[PDB]
Amino acid sequence: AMGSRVVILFTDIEESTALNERIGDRAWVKLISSHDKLVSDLVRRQSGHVVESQGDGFMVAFARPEQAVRCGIELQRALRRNAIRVRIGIHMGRSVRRGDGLFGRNVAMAYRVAAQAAGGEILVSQPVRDALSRSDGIRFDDGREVELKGFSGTYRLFAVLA
Amino acid sequence: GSRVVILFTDIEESTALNERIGDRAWVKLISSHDKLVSDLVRRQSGHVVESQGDGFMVAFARPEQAVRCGIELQRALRRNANREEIRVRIGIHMGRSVRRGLFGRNVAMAYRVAAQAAGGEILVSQPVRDALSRSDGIRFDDGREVELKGFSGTYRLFAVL
Ligand SMILES: Nc1ncnc2c1ncn2[C@@H]1O[C@H](COP(=O)(O)OP(=O)(O)OP(=O)(O)O)[C@@H](O)[C@H]1O
Ligand SMILES: Nc1ncnc2c1ncn2[C@@H]1O[C@H](COP(=O)(O)OP(=O)(O)OP(=O)(O)O)[C@@H](O)[C@H]1O
Ligand SMILES: [Ca+2]
Ligand SMILES: [Ca+2]
């Protein structure tokens, strides 16, 4: 349908509710605020754009898939340095721009991919894994077929290595 | 944070719906839905805080405003279904949440109530139920104990009849 091709990145903090209940709102608000600041800096460093700031994570838009992945790699490296565990999913395709937001099935797919990822892991769809086959120095695993809610059939998702 | 009533909406199987009608038709629907929700919220002096994908987070000062909004919304959706069909979950919780540019365990709690609700159903937390136990036009069931993700123990959620 309508829209231009874009790379969509979704973050998703693992077990944020349990963490919130554990440290309390005061400590939680301070933590997520610093987290928001961290993600914001890294996204800008890869020419990305934070589209929406959900309660647990963010939706981010990039022009190039390599920008999105590299942002993910740097984000995971920074979080481990501070050690919160975060899931990262990356998908690309056409998406409908409405206002300053993004809508469509590929937006849903993007989060779906992120939801399959483990804490501290970066997962990507096959189109992203294909667009980036021969790119130094980004390496993927062998992939795995998974069923995703709302979509028929199966989809192969790939994790970023190192 | 300050006291506030949080209402969450959540469309049932929106992804499958998106795939069935296509992005073009999908944007028409959610846009139309966005206006319907927003107008009813405003009528109850509520304010739409966020629109995370297929749902909305709404803040009310008083609990009766949130429930009355939920009832009118579910009545409106049913009226649209009889005349694409869309089922929506509604969860309502009240508690203190910090305002940043809303955040807090009570924001998460509010969503959790909505997620437990069936399509076309309105679920409310115990505090909301107690505040409106004798409200006009509002009646609740006997409620049911449930386990909520991230929260220890169990919580009793009441449905608006
Ligand atoms: N279906 C949904 N639609 C919109 N927002 C959601 C949805 N599910 C969760 N959220 C947002 O994310 C928050 C809850 O996070 P979530 O459901 O991811 O659980 P969590 O505690 O972080 O654990 P985990 O991610 O490990 O499952 C909610 O407060 C809500 O704001
Ligand atoms: N944990 C979460 N944090 C933030 N946003 C979420 C979360 N879970 C879901 N969402 C948002 O909700 C949208 C659809 O999610 P959802 O799981 O509600 O799909 P669905 O097809 O409506 O399934 P269901 O019928 O179970 O609601 C996604 O595109 C995403 O933007
Ligand atoms: Ca989460
Ligand atoms: Ca939904």
Side-chain angles (χ1 to χ4, degrees), chain A residues 1 3-4 6-29 31-43 46-51 53 55-76 78-80 82-84 86-96 99-133 135 137-138 140-162, chain B residues 1-2 4-23 25-42 44-49 51 53-63 65-77 79-82 87-98 101-138 140-146 148-153 155-161:
Chain A
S4 185
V6 61
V7 181
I8 302 171
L9 188 151
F10 263 103
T11 62
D12 181 28
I13 296 171
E14 186 180 46
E15 301 167 15
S16 64
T17 303
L19 174 58
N20 190 179
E21 281 291 274
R22 191 151 65 261
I23 65 173
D25 281 344
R26 186 187 176 93
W28 170 247
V29 169
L31 191 178
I32 192 71
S33 180
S34 60
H35 183 70
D36 177 276
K37 207 279 195 178
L38 177 58
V39 176
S40 298
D41 297 340
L42 296 175
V43 166
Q46 297 295 338
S47 300
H49 302 281
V50 180
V51 185
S53 178
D56 57 342
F58 309 89
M59 188 178 73
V60 189
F62 298 83
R64 297 131 159 270
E66 31 269 293
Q67 294 172 333
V69 177
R70 282 189 165 89
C71 178
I73 295 171
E74 290 181 16
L75 175 56
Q76 298 287 26
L79 290 171
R80 292 192 303 271
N82 299 341
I84 296 175
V86 183
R87 310 177 178 91
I88 299 176
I90 311 175
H91 174 51
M92 74 179 298
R94 292 169 295 177
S95 296
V96 186
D100 247 87
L102 296 174
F103 292 79
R105 59 100 66 185
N106 280 327
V107 181
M109 175 64 71
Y111 166 75
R112 226 63 258 172
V113 170
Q116 310 310 306
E121 182 174 42
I122 305 166
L123 287 184
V124 309
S125 62
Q126 196 167 354
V128 180
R129 150 64 217 188
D130 289 340
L132 294 173
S133 311
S135 52
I138 297 168
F140 304 95
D141 66 7
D142 292 313
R144 58 184 184 267
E145 302 290 353
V146 297
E147 297 183 18
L148 306 177
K149 182 175 64 176
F151 303 99
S152 61
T154 64
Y155 294 79
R156 197 170 184 82
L157 308 182
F158 301 79
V160 182
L161 303 183
Chain B
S2 181
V4 62
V5 180
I6 300 175
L7 186 156
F8 270 96
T9 66
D10 187 15
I11 299 169
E12 184 177 11
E13 303 181 42
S14 62
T15 305
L17 173 58
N18 206 148
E19 285 286 275
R20 193 166 73 259
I21 66 177
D23 281 350
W26 168 243
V27 173
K28 305 182 196 189
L29 179 62
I30 189 68
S31 299
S32 179
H33 183 69
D34 169 85
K35 173 171 180 59
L36 175 58
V37 173
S38 294
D39 289 338
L40 295 175
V41 162
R42 285 182 194 109
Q44 299 295 343
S45 299
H47 180 70
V48 185
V49 187
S51 304
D54 71 326
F56 305 99
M57 187 182 71
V58 190
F60 302 83
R62 299 162 69 259
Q65 296 167 326
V67 175
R68 287 173 188 178
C69 180
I71 295 169
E72 288 187 17
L73 180 57
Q74 293 289 9
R75 181 182 296 97
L77 293 167
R79 248 188 281 100
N80 292 338
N82 297 11
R87 302 180 64 192
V88 181
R89 312 177 175 93
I90 298 177
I92 309 172
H93 175 61
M94 61 181 294
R96 292 181 178 275
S97 300
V98 183
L102 298 171
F103 293 84
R105 57 92 63 185
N106 286 321
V107 183
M109 170 56 67
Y111 167 75
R112 265 327 125 196
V113 173
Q116 291 297 141
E121 186 180 36
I122 308 169
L123 288 181
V124 304
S125 57
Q126 180 78 53
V128 178
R129 177 264 169 194
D130 293 347
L132 307 173
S133 64
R134 288 184 77 64
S135 287
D136 180 88
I138 300 173
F140 305 98
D141 64 345
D142 296 336
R144 58 182 182 273
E145 303 294 346
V146 294
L148 303 176
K149 187 177 71 174
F151 298 101
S152 59
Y155 294 82
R156 196 165 191 84
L157 309 183
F158 300 82
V160 181
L161 301 180

